[PDB]
């Protein structure tokens, strides 16, 4: 007729076979089941995540290999350092023999110094990828995972002749002396005067009292220094040695004083710095100040009430609350004469703001120089607790040591002491010239020389009863070398543990990569059998459909031969 | 298809086998099980500490050998010192014989001094590695351990001819007697008054004035002692050393003196004395005097004439002349009015008249005590002929020297010296105590000790600038030699004990080194059988993995043929 419905079904069934055949061909050529999101959207997403993880795990295997390389290089350098240290130890054992002369000791010291220089050279020159692995106490992070944060830390340490405790190590240095027995010439050089009654030279030693700066340097944790005497001008400049800063409760009183510190803390351009204003209304009314002034609560311009409470909206006839508003209100309290136990602990500093009648108060932090400057025209007092004893010292506005209280002094050895002065009387033997101590006013002090002993001249030029001195490595040299060897061995042990951990990590990464590859294969990879079977079926249907369509184009020919 | 999970597993197993193969290869080539801290961290550290100990112990063996060498050298020197001491002892035993003369004692002392010098030379020259082992009392420290403080002390002593107590050892006089340095106490004891201005000490040595009797005891031949004031009353006594007596001009101015002179010359019973009488005209008559003092002229009675002539012709009533008449005739002349001089020789003494004065002058002898008694009440003087001063020494009537005249003084040694007193100032070194000489008195004095020299207190207690003093033979020399031998034997015994201790220490060091080497071998050395087994297993696994990997890469290709 004019319509060929059968040809239309033939065409539709044919066009289905083209689609099936094309899908089979694409899957066969590409080797992938999921060639598009059409095939499997969820499968494609899971497969892409698996692909990203697999690529990251392979790159993490490479990174772990790099970490292995770093550890191997560092341990190789440390092995040479250990060999040099062991040779130095053998030379030191040789040097302790008494048969060696000074020339022998110097010849041994030549090689010892050469090996120490070699240790330093290995430290400064060993490098992996431009990283001095033996120069810094740092932590190298090796990414052994496909996601952020998965890493292994190699704890690198600085190993030179100085950090090992071998700086200035020697065996040829001078060992002990004889102290050059003192005579009357040493006595008159030291300042001793002779009493004509007995002829025994008396030496009076007077020490210098510690300055306020000296004691401020000698302050310990928690030590309290009061600065001021008049009215309430005394300031409790308690020293927080945890930070090296002297905290103190500062107090302001005037309107401009409330105007300043409110402006000092502020967000520069577009930040939202936040200070904890804590009033006894029932909670800490913390604000959200933005830019210059413009104090706000919950993102809306704030308003102070009669009682000082913070709210984000007040009556129409009221300007917005600024930082100065709340902060001077803290200065002036609340409800007029009410105490208003209040505070403005703004991100740190606790602006308590007094809270009796008016005024400010806040635990500000000054420095040692600040307290020294403050205590320059007023009296100061130091309380040295921490040790049960109090040892309270005082200083006038002039700055001299107070007669009252404990008078601390500094000796000629640079050590603080309470022995301000002491007299020692020596007698000079007219026959041999020997000088022997006789009397000591400091009867129980640490500076007393035992009576009757010969006095010698120390290497530092001071009179003493000791007869020897120092100058070489008198500290046990083999013990120091053993300590250095122990440090090197500890670092080597840490590196070996890290190497084992990296080996385990590489094994785990390999296994996980293989397993995830199998999992992704089960989703994305095509099958030879299934796709070739689909191809063959689609081809057979294609041929059948073409034959059927060719036949169907012939029936209306007969029909219209009957209707024509 | 696209994934080859079987090939991935094959690759992982292949890599593991290759890593095991590499470890086995490295252990085989190195010969050590612990080639890194990866293998055994604690084992590596323990092996390193054991290596340090073993190296220290080998070096300690070397040091102990050095100590053995030092002890052997010192004992070898002491053997020669002992041989010299024994030869000296044998010579001393020889010297004690009473038949030895002074020459033989000097001959023995020559060899004794040579052997003492040899002992000193051995002491000063014996040296090990620049260490004089026989010169100081010290303690040599030999390091016999791998750590600090492990050491053995060789107690070395100073052995010379002085420390053995043989300084100034003699069998003849000789003698050394080391002097003692003078000090301030010596200056005070001597009598030196300290100069409080200059700090020096000034002593004044004074000599007593010469006494008359002491100087008559020092009288020489031909010298004169004049006693009396005035030329007409002085008596001159000329000394004779051969007779030891003083001869003088004795005068007889009275008849009593003539009678006493006759009485002195009176011979005993049966004795006669011959003499001669010279007349004024020169005639000489020979006479003999009998026991009664009565004169016999040629065996006949002698008579004195009116002119004093002696003849045997008898005058009527003339009395026979006695001995006394001759002196009267010679002195007072004949009849008291004859001024003719006469001479009479008798008793070996010649008596002559003054010619114008009645008296006899003759030569008479006297003793020193006679001169002293004569001068005990009248001024005296002594003329020195050969001596320090050939001048007159005057004495008052009281026997004291005249101030206005030459003064002679007797020194501290009983000898004559014109230096009455002398002076010397000493400086005192305030530091050392050494007493040096800065100045003396008049430089003419030979007693002036040397300038700028150390003064010494001699064995006599004197102050002299001379080291040593003349000593005597050694007392109990064999005991001193035995004591020196005992000291040498004691030091040799100490050295032998230290040698035995060093031998034991060396044995212990070798044993401990062997044991620690065995322990370190157990910890560190590689068992070669195990490592070869691991190598073979890894190689077989590598081949199997390569075959399996080839098959795994082969398996997917069936898809191509089965695709069609």
Coordinates of N, CA, C and O in Angstrom, one line a residue, chain A residues 237 246-250 349-351 361-366:
Chain A
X237 N 55.6 43.1 90.3 CA 56.2 42.6 89.0 C 56.7 41.2 89.1 O 57.8 40.9 89.0
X246 N 57.9 39.7 82.8 CA 57.4 40.0 84.1 C 55.9 40.4 84.0 O 55.6 41.5 83.4
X247 N 55.0 39.6 84.5 CA 53.6 40.0 84.5 C 53.3 40.8 85.7 O 53.9 40.8 86.7
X248 N 52.3 41.7 85.5 CA 51.9 42.7 86.5 C 50.5 43.2 86.3 O 50.1 43.3 85.1
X249 N 49.8 43.5 87.3 CA 48.4 44.0 87.3 C 48.4 45.5 87.1 O 48.4 46.2 88.1
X250 N 48.5 46.0 85.9 CA 48.5 47.4 85.6 C 47.1 48.0 85.8 O 46.0 47.3 85.7
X349 N 45.2 38.8 77.3 CA 45.2 39.8 78.4 C 43.9 39.9 79.0 O 42.9 40.1 78.4
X350 N 43.9 39.8 80.4 CA 42.7 39.8 81.2 C 42.5 41.2 81.7 O 43.0 41.6 82.8
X351 N 41.7 42.0 81.0 CA 41.4 43.4 81.4 C 40.3 43.4 82.5 O 39.1 43.5 82.2
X361 N 42.3 47.7 85.3 CA 43.2 46.6 85.9 C 43.3 45.5 84.9 O 42.3 45.1 84.3
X362 N 44.5 45.1 84.6 CA 44.7 44.0 83.6 C 46.1 43.4 83.8 O 47.1 44.1 84.1
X363 N 46.2 42.1 83.7 CA 47.5 41.4 83.8 C 48.3 41.6 82.6 O 48.5 40.7 81.7
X364 N 48.9 42.8 82.5 CA 49.8 43.0 81.4 C 51.2 42.4 81.6 O 51.5 42.0 82.7
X365 N 52.0 42.3 80.6 CA 53.3 41.7 80.6 C 54.3 42.7 80.2 O 54.3 43.3 79.0
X366 N 55.3 43.0 81.0 CA 56.5 43.9 80.7 C 57.7 43.0 80.6 O 57.7 41.8 80.8

